[model samples]
Target: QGAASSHKLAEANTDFAFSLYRELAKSSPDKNIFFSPVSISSALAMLSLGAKGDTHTQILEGLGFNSEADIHQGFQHLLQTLNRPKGLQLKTANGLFVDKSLKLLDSFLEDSKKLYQAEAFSVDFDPEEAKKQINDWVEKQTNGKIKDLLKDLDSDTVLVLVNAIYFKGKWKKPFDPENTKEEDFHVDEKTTVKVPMMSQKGKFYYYHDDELSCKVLELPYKGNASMLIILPDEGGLQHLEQSLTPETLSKWLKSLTRRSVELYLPKFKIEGTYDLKEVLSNLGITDLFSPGADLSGITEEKLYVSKAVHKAVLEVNEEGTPPEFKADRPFLFLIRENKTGSILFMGKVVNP
Candidate 1:
């Protein structure tokens, strides 16, 4: 029980961080640019510097976790939030820290020192070993729903970020996976395509207006918090984008209490990659990446996170993971935890 609660607390920290990213997604262009696994993981690690014990658990409960479900449900939700709203590439290295919730990330590599030492340059991981670790983490986090999330991770991978989020809870109104089907989806107004959609037709926590509509979905982990899913209606995507102000986004999310509604989400498979310097500069966060940056925590005044790299992947349908799911193509966006491996921010880069 104690182990489960601890896992839930960690997952909660990550999800709470992703909620913040959903709004920050707007500041980027290609949407995939901020997919810097380094930056995202670093952000989460930075947040841990301030996270206490109980303060962490309460945050997870706020995200909708009950501490009774398996860790996979919650981890999947964390993955969705990290890579969903935006389809950016994500990679989080977990071994760099000494936290119980973060120890699972260690299975990925022998050492994170190589990564920090080689910042801005490439750091390599044993392919076979990496594959094994990634699959193990995926299985553990997803309860075997997903086994492998690393694909085509090459020697050029300057940095790799890994995350393990766990949420557990039955759906407020569970969707019969047996009833799943392929349906017509509008890739764009004039562009329609058929894709498998996760169907859950029941009153859910939802909000809609003349221009905006959204359904709330909860993803639970074994510990205490669940990853929250919010899918907007046809034109509603714009509503989420237009009201990107942090204050407005905060108000919207805070107002999102569980309610009755239906949810229809398209299962998608996409990958993407982008540069972070431009994105951060656009977000008015230039100092950290610039000369004045103070990442002395990782190194003395001599070293700082020189360049940030993110590689994220996602699939709405249920299934196993891939080995070389490269972010070579354009996709949504993602946010991940830092040294703590707690998801800080993530989303879909709609415009990108």
Candidate 2:
């Protein structure tokens, strides 16, 4: 009976982890106006290990993550089922992500009984060598998906927050590359930009209504799941962003009927990096890095996710990059389960 109870609790924890990150990933479109698949996945990995509730709450508060969804009630009910968060520290800026990351890799090694085959890096190193070694490790982990991604590092680097994702999954029903054509994408109706628009007229999630000035396209993913992409009439990006929230995000998704409709989408990829200090501050995660912070759980050390840097690169040049865009849509988005992956580090990409 005790074993069964523990198993049930573990199942519930996994469910909660999936659900929490799913919401965060879906809602991320609120800020950038473009959805980042990798970021959402990474954030979930970090959140799952149990950072300070206050930090997560502050971030949500800053990002306007309040929700009327009864999700938290269920979480509260299952709180007691959670394992004691072990080895978490604030001195390493809520070393939850890193600590958990190393631990997971270690366990993976141990489980396979490949201890000799696995190697772990020491926490201390020379600055340049450390940076190179860290980057090499990241690139190696991603199988070269991420390269030359890190610029520098130091013991004071606080948090090395990474979000790496590679999605090679082909469409269940492929879009003919030959059918793709150049279409006029309006930055604003006054200024039209010509871009390659990939069109596929099969079964897709789409909607057309005179109530709104633009057509909405839905791209289905595995499991009847889909991403809703809206192309506004003209210069509607800001307006669309203004209307974005967890509530509106959910509404946009639920509004899809999944009927057949014309689908015109720009094939584009964009990679971006950012120093998250300002943004996280803008989002209200002030205490974790400052005085009066209570991250004692991490290591009895005083630390927080001091500075956050993010770097992203995407190309949508048809053959050169990805599907074309009018520069109207910010970029592409990817979303998925965090536990199946990891977030090594995050930062702002000031320059490509």
Candidate 3:
């Protein structure tokens, strides 16, 4: 009984992640969208632990959680599962940088560390040095792929919550570097760009959705993690994007079947950074950033979130042996936990 309910809560959080993706897409349709939903959700979950009243309610609702206990338990379950031994190099780190003067609640600190595996640190709130400290920590966590995440810190900023995740996995079936060649990638009906498309032929878990007009393929890493690539029919990328949701995604993946395919995917590298305060406010999460914010759960003094920043980097190359699905054009991709269906990172390569 508890297991089923916990899975349901996790599914709801997945829905919330995609909802946030839509909002992010609205602002940057032409650019690449890449971020770790798990990382962002973890940071927010930690912040929510210290929130009270409306601030707490908004965070829970925005994150697609029905209750406090469910949210915490669901995240704990996910974190524990992902942290289990695996061949791939995957690490997620969470940190809370609060002003040294603020005395955080012992319960909040203890619970956050125990449940979320988050670490807390104290800083003087120095604009330059504080930014450096946070950015340095992120840089270390992401293997230096993500750097300078925070530009500057406000003088009044009391607490800064950060989460960083890094993943490095080699495909179970690696593509031959010699087979990679410059090929045409249609960005749209009118524009085309030359990309280094890596080619391979092998068996893969695949599906073709007639309704969404897209082909779905899964490439497993040495570990249990896998990357799901969804390539739409010419001119159907927009339709597929609009049709994306947690429910629809579950349905689509369930339809995949094992089959031999000739895969053509591009070797690409991309990075993304986002300031989430405004985007989150648009998603009915405003009270946490305002003066009315009630974060007494963390401390007795008044506290409100000042900023939230996220940065991610990904590279796709000829590290795998073979595959049949062609990802020559724009495609949506997700790095997910095979067991939990938790999307660690998601993005679309519109031009790459």
TM-score of each: 0.47, 0.59, 0.92
lDDT by residue (1-352, candidate 3, tens digit) is 2322667656766887798888888888878888888777777877888887888888878887654444677778778887778634565556788888988888998998888888888779978888988888877876786677777778888878676655557788998989999999887778899999898788899998888888898989777888989988877777788888988788978898988899898988876777768878777888887767898998898877777677677878877543347777788888888878788888988867
Estimate the overall C-alpha local distance difference test score of candidate 1. 0.39
Prediction-by-prediction clash tally: 59, 43, 11
Computed on alpha carbons, the lDDT of every model, listed in order, comes to 0.39, 0.39, 0.79
RMSD (CA, Å), candidate 2 to true, equals 10.0
**Which residue runs does candidate 1 get wrong by more than 4 Å?**
1-174, 209-223, 227-233, 245-260, 269-275, 284-301, 318-345, 349-352
Query: Which candidate would rank higher by TM-score, 2 or 3?
Result: 3
Worst 10 residues of 1 by lDDT: 320-329
Q: What is every candidate's alpha-carbon RMSD to the true fold?
A: 12.6, 10.0, 2.4
Better of 1 and 3 by TM-score: 3
lDDT of 3 at 10: 69
Q: Residue by residue across 131-206, what tens digits does model 2's lDDT show? A: 5756666677556766765676655544345444322323446567897888765443355656677766666655
- Model 1, 55-84: lDDT tens digits are 323222434354232333334344444444
